[PDB]
Structures are given as C-alpha cells and as structure tokens.
Amino acid sequence: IRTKEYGFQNFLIDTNILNRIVDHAEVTEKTGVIEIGPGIALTEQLAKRAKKVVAFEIDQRLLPILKDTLSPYENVTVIHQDVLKADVKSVIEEQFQDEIMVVANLPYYVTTPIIMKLLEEHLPLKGIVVMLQKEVAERMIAVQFYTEAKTVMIVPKTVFVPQPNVDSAVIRLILRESFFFQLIKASFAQRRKTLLNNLVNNLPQVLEETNIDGKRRGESLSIEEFAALSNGLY
Question: Which residues of this UniProt protein bind S-adenosyl-L-methionine?
C-alpha cells in the first residue's frame, strides 16, 4: 500500500494477484502489451516481465501521477488517446518490433465497444484479457466469432482500495459475404421488440425462415443460428 495522497477510479492493492493476471497473459520478455486504463499498478509488475508496454489513458489527471509512478521502468510509454478513437494499428507499427496481448481495465458502458474495435480491424494480437465485474463474466460472450473465452481466475473486493461491494473477475480471449456484422447490428436495434421490427430498421423485403420463429427476439438466437440468416442475400 504505497498508494499515497493528490486526492482520495478505484484501484487494486496487492501484487499477489497481478502476476496471476500476468500469468494468464501469455506474457514474456518476447511479447509486448497494450495496457488500457492504467491508474496507478498493473502496468508496473507488467513492465517487470514484458518486452514493452503501451498504456492507453483518456484521463489527463493520471499523467503527472504516471510521470513519477512507473517512471523508473524504462520499457513503458503512456500514449494519451481515446482508445475507442485511437490509432492502435498505427501504434503497433510505431512501438513493437513480438506477440502482443492487450490487458484492459474498462467500465461496462464502453468496455464492450472497445473490445470490438480492437478485434474488428483484424489486428494481429495473441489475445484480449479484460477485468470486469463478477456478475458480467459469469453471464456466459457477445461475439464468440472472433474469439472463444475462458473466465479464468476470480478477483475479490478484498484486494481493492475503495473496496467496491461486488467482487470482480478476469476473462482472457485468445483469438483464432460478412454483412453478417451489419446483420447483428440491425437485429438488436429495438432490443425488446419482435424480429419484424428490428429488420425494419435495416437497409431495404421477402424472407422465408430457415427453421426459425418470426416473432422470436434478438438475444435468443444461437451464434451458429445467426450465421444461417445472414446467408439470405449477402
């Protein structure tokens, strides 16, 4: 608990876990890493076993803190951009000679968009680990198309500084015609209303079901089922 002063965003405490996290990253002196939402903590113990680290933070307030926190470590560069509106393909060419494994600490609201954006441009990563709440992880998986997931290692409230009420979890995601991605966007518009309604918020009429109820809703359809529909007229 070196976490002094500034003002008392909530943070971790013991390294006990952090190298377990880092353990669940396929991390080496060979691999690089794209840290998102650093605070400071993760990034320090992360810098002590990685090739290079690339921290991403929109919060200005943290940079004079990271000015001296994680200053001593020399394989760290804290780029200051909105990760969502970021130039991360361009920063890979700019900072990694290399396997890459993004580690990310993001809140529910934007966390699901971000993971998409990283994946979405076919970027060359080993995998995408993310710390989220206990509830949300157990929920198993928005797109298992780009990658298949494992909710490995739980993380308790009792290793945090404000001590959030609900315990959290970590989730690693190693990766391995397509208007499909326009389809899932179109099918989820109203969210609550029927499939008729959602595919009349979509580009342009006739459509026989391939073993699938009309009035059935978006959040039901299995991931393989959702491919079959896309093969209407791509």
Answer: 10, 12, 37, 57, 82, 105
